[PDB]
Copies of this chain bind each other. A is one copy, B any other.
Amino acid sequence: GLDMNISQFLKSLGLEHLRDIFETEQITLDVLADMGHEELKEIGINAYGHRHKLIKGVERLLGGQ
């Protein structure tokens, strides 16, 4: 909704337990918006369900609905 960042975004998806990965890997929203399943696997998001939630989450966030 109101002026986004990664911490908030992960909390809105129930994925706050990936904050460490995101922090170490310096994944901002601009970066995350360019990433698919392969790339998220490269940074250690092993669960398909987590990758899916992220991928759809960031499209939703930036897409205007």
Contact = CB atoms under 8 A, between A and B. Distances in A.
Interface of A is mostly: helix
Interface residues of A, number: 20
Nearest to A15: B26
A48 B22 CA distance: 9
Given A34-B56, A56-B34, A26 B49 contact: yes
B53 A31 contact: yes
A19 interface: no
A50 B53 CA distance: 23
A52 interface: yes
A18 B50 CA distance: 18
B42 A48 contact: yes
